Symmetry: C4
Subunit: 241 residues, 4 copies
């Protein structure tokens, strides 16, 4: 806090700043979707490859700026910690072989979420219900793990594509949980060899399904036992006073 | 408003009018479903091709009439703006090659919704919940867009049917969202070439699913935090008075 | 009402009666499931074919009896009107070619629902929510009908198995509504010929899905705006008195 | 209750005890997942086969101990009755041919549920909603049974894989209930021979679906008519006093 600090802070904290970024984002958003056509890249492919590190430099400056204005507060903000890591990726140079990072650059278009406050709101609402589910996700993951281990031991030797491995079996059990091809694609083939295999997967389909449904019912029915306490408290008070 | 205006207004606004239309609709409804059989069209196919522009002329008159009675109010009514556009299509002449318009004529059977007030009610109820979802639809569409761009770049070269293009990838990601063949039909083929592809689509299946469920829970649990404010307000008042 | 009438009424209305029937039902239930094995029918197949019209005669008597005791009240009771029609079928003689009626006999095992009061309760609960949905089922059926007509006209010539006919198209559109193979099995084949076919089925999948979800939300959120009126009425009263 | 009894009781009831078990569990959990790789078992396969009956003996002692401390109370506790039966299996010797029991040993990893109180909580919540559903599960199972019998009689001769048998038909009807391949995989093949087969499976798909949805709505809407009685009772009381 001083003369020079405050000068920057008023740039960074301005609405022009955030809108310039939001524009860059929507602009580089469109550019990244045009960068998708081989036709376009043969023609205008240099313009957008240059338009790209333009936005990357701007976003780096813009991040640098925000870290000066916000100090340690910046690395405790989940919203901006994101932009940090998402612009960080987009800075790793395109020449190192690893395809996964060149494509990671598109993750910068998620700044439109952190930048726009209406978007931040939804994400925070959606994220907010996760912490209560951690217990049930742990139970479910344990349940998957126990069953993935059993299926490997039961079906992996004859059915190695689907169950040869703790991971192949995790994958198949998830597919079964999504109910996708679970009978025609998986369990019926299984039963030509293991006639009682339906005794494994139907109860799995029952339990995994039952938990999913209850999880939702618990959310709804618990989210509104709370509104019914608040409201009686506000009703008990006006009948006393 | 005058002698001549009021004469028409009493025709248009009558219940005979709306019922005559509702009858024409249900009648041309049935005719359009009989127009479906080649057998029937070989025999009675002229009767119904003529019965058709009969209804079209009537409906045009009927629309003309309603515009005189209702003035500028007509082009601010969503319900009637529809019948306008839906009869407008049915007027474009059958001879111009474009198959899409000849079939559009069946959209006139949706006038049974605008005509019948019980139907209008449901549609308005269903439409009414959309405006609050616009934020989440925007988030989801952005999310699809970011992922459609990544998948094109990741899988389009080897898997051009499913991911060769921003649109092919949109399509596949929607199919994956519907969970249809997502593992047997898509992700398992993908993994013969891209062993880690499950790292893209499971989290996509998780996020897209999670949002869908939360959207519903939000509707229910928010639609009824409101009833719990109204009711305490009506309870706080009678304990004060 | 008299000496002779009352004698029968006390048989019919007894608990021994209903339990004898409930036993016959569970007994003929088991018999009808054993009648399923060719092995068993080669051995004991006469015992159960005779055990069958035994139960049929008993059930006819039992129905006759109940009609005397209950008079016109019997043909206004949905529960017993059922047993009437379900035993009526089981009386039509096995020799007339029509396979559909021989198998209809198994419908008598549904008397265990009408007989047992715990069962009647659920069915009445489940049936009870249907009447409010009649509007939306009508809207949906109209919507299917309009779209089934369009799809026949659009895809039936090249794709006659799936869309050759108003009924083939109804069937496919339902399958699409269940999301079953909708993309791999139907819409993707369609698009090799009709590249824009996704413009028909995605919006269909959107609308049909949207309505389904809203129907449920409406049930829940409306079933409990009522409990919130009852309860404020009971709360407003005790604050007045 | 005495000097010697109390000495053991203070071991068993200690937190060190339960944590030692919880550690053994998570340790043997990891071991059972490593026991999955043929690579690992070629190397360290003896260490973990020995680490296994180590844990089994400990768990037997640990169970013996708990039965002394808890007396008849132990065989009335569902939580510990489980560990009993789950360690009991793991004690049956690996040499008797029956593959099903060697794999059952993994069920011991479910002790992490009974051991950890956060886990016990969820399971008890989830289990708690089952008793009210027993009626509807009975109705559904009856409904399946009636339909499984009809389908065997209707489609089993031509379609023995799917409907040759009361059990094959149960299986298929469940698959149809999960909607998995129900049209492409089952009903469409059926209709090449039985053109009206859609008259069996669509109503089955309707009823079975309808019940599922209503079951959930009943849970939610009934779980919270109760909160609305409790809260008015607590509101009626403070307006009287
Ligand atoms: C969130 C996004 C996560 C997506 C990760 C999965 C996608 C994926 O595997 O994409 C392919 C890349 C790069 O190819 P890679 O798997 O290295 O080689 C494939 C074999 N080839 C080139 C010789 C035909 O593979 C990787 O990037 C592997 C990353 C781990
Ligand atoms: C309510 C929500 C309930 C969620 C319950 C848990 C869901 C787990 C979802 C399944 C995850 C999955 O696909 O696991 C695969 C991985 C890696 O196995 P891997 O053998 O590398 O790959 C399998 C496919 N292959 C052979 C063709 C390359 O296997 C693993 O490494 C296990 C990953 C477990 C993640 C748990 C997250 C929660
Ligand atoms: C009861 C409490 C339990 C708590 C502990 C849970 C965590 C234990 C982790 C154990 C990891 C075991 C890894 C493992 O076995 O790797 C298997 C394979 C590699 O097999 P590999 O040895 O390469 O090939 C063997 C030869 N072959 C090809 C002929 C079969 O590679 C794979 O399949 C990948 C490994 C996937 C691991 C998934 C871990 C899920 C964690 C769930 C935690 C639940 C907590 C509540
Ligand atoms: C909760 C609700 C969440 C909804 C999230 C967004 C859902 C998007 C659904 C997917 C739409 C879709 O199929 O996009 C296809 C189009 C056109 O691509 P196009 O390459 O013309 O056609 C693909 C198929 N082909 C090559 C065989 C002709 O691709 C586009 O042009 C993109 C259309 C985006 C529409 C977004 C509507 C919301
Ligand atoms: C971060 C903020 C982002 C905001 C901006 C979002 C809108 C950007 C629109 C970009 C449109 C890009 C269109 C495009 O690249 O067309 C691709 C293809 C035509 O490819 P084409 O050049 O014919 O063929 C190349 C050669 N080949 C066949 C060998 C591959 O044709 C297609 O694939 C059809 C184009 C489908 C466009 C779908 C647009 C979805 C908009 C989502 C908006 C989300 C807002 C929150
Ligand atoms: C509720 C239950 C409704 C079930 C109706 C659909 C079942 C179905 O179609 O079952 C087959 C029967 C009898 O066979 P049907 O369709 O008369 O002849 C098949 C051709 N064949 C014998 C020469 C191979 O077909 C019928 O029973 C047709 C009934 C209309
Ligand atoms: C929320 C609930 C929304 C429900 C909306 C309506 C659902 C309609 C479900 C579809 C019914 C269906 O499969 O229709 C087929 C029939 C008969 O067509 P048909 O050509 O006899 O048989 C088609 C199959 N084939 C050629 C192999 C024999 O086609 C018809 O005859 C039409 C039947 C319409 C029944 C509407 C019931 C409501
Ligand atoms: C806008 C208001 C509308 C209100 C009226 C709705 C009811 C209209 C009923 C019209 C019935 C039309 C029947 C019809 O066209 O039959 C078509 C086929 C028989 O075709 P066919 O003439 O044997 O074969 C022609 C030659 N071929 C094989 C080369 C194509 O056979 C079939 O496809 C069976 C017919 C299925 C009829 C389904 C009716 C659904 C009613 C939905 C009502 C919604 C009300 C809100
Ligand atoms: C809401 C919840 C609604 C639940 C309604 C009931 C769901 C029943 C689920 C279907 C169970 C199932 O798959 O049944 C199969 C068994 C055994 O038949 P089986 O012939 O041994 O095996 C069939 C497969 N095969 C020939 C390849 C070996 O068939 C039986 O033995 C019947 C088992 C009935 C269990 C009912 C549990 C409730
Ligand atoms: C209306 C009240 C009803 C209450 C009673 C319900 C229980 C009745 C149980 C009847 C059990 C019938 C067993 C049976 O028939 O076994 C059939 C097959 C064995 O056939 P099999 O004789 O080996 O082979 C015949 C020759 N072949 C291969 C050429 C066809 O093997 C199988 O398919 C396995 C048997 C599966 C039985 C599933 C039982 C479900 C119980 C549902 C109870 C609902 C209660 C509300
Ligand atoms: C009961 C179940 C499962 C855990 C269990 O059964 N034990 C858990 C999992 C998700 C949890 C809810 C969400 O977190 C949202 C919200 C957060 C607030 O902070 C407290 C209220 C509320 C409604 C939570 C209540 C409850 O905790 C839920 C339903
Ligand atoms: C919270 C979520 C997602 C948006 C977000 O999380 N931000 C949004 C999306 C759909 C929205 C509801 C519907 O619109 C129906 C209705 C309209 C009324 O006008 C106000 C009340 C109500 C219940 C809305 C509340 C809330 O706004 C919802 C649940
Ligand atoms: C609003 C929607 C759709 C119709 C529409 O939007 N118009 C309709 C369809 C199903 C209807 C409910 C059920 O019938 C059960 C119940 C019957 C009682 O009698 C009155 C209350 C309740 C909760 C009904 C309220 C409402 O009527 C619902 C939600
Ligand atoms: C009405 C339906 C179906 C049975 C039927 O309709 N008859 C049944 C099946 C599941 C039942 C609920 C659960 O058990 C959970 C809970 C247990 C409490 O103890 C009492 C309250 C509550 C909410 C139950 C209410 C009701 O009983 C339900 C909804």
């Amino acid at each position: 806090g001083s003369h020079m600090y405050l000068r920057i802070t008023n740039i960074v904290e301005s609405s022009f700043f955030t809108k310039f970024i939001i524009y860059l984002i929507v602009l580089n958003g469109i550019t990244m979707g045009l960068e998708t056509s081989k036709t376009f890249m043969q023609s205008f492919g240099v313009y957008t490859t240059l338009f790209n590190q333009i936005v990357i430099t701007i976003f780096t400056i813009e991040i640098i700026l925000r870290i000066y204005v916000h100090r340690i507060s910046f690395f405790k903000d989940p919203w901006s910690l994101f932009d940090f890591f998402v612009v960080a990726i987009s800075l790793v140079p395109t020449s190192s072989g690893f395809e996964i990072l060149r494509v990671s650059r598109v993750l910068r278009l998620f700044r439109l979420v952190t930048a726009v406050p209406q978007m931040r709101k939804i994400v925070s609402a959606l994220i907010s219900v996760i912490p209560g589910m951690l217990s049930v996700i742990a139970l479910m993951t344990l349940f998957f793990y126990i069953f993935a281990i059993m299926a490997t031991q039961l079906f992996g030797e004859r059915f190695p594509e689907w169950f040869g491995t703790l991971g192949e079996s995790f994958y198949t059990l998830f597919q079964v949980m999504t109910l996708e091809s679970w009978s025609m694609g998986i369990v019926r083939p299984l039963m030509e060899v293991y006639p009682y295999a339906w005794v494994f997967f139907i109860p799995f389909i029952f339990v995994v399904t039952f938990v999913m449904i209850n999880l939702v019912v618990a959310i709804i029915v618990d989210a509104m036992a709370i509104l019914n306490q608040k409201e009686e408290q506000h009703i008990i008070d006006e009948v006393q006073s």
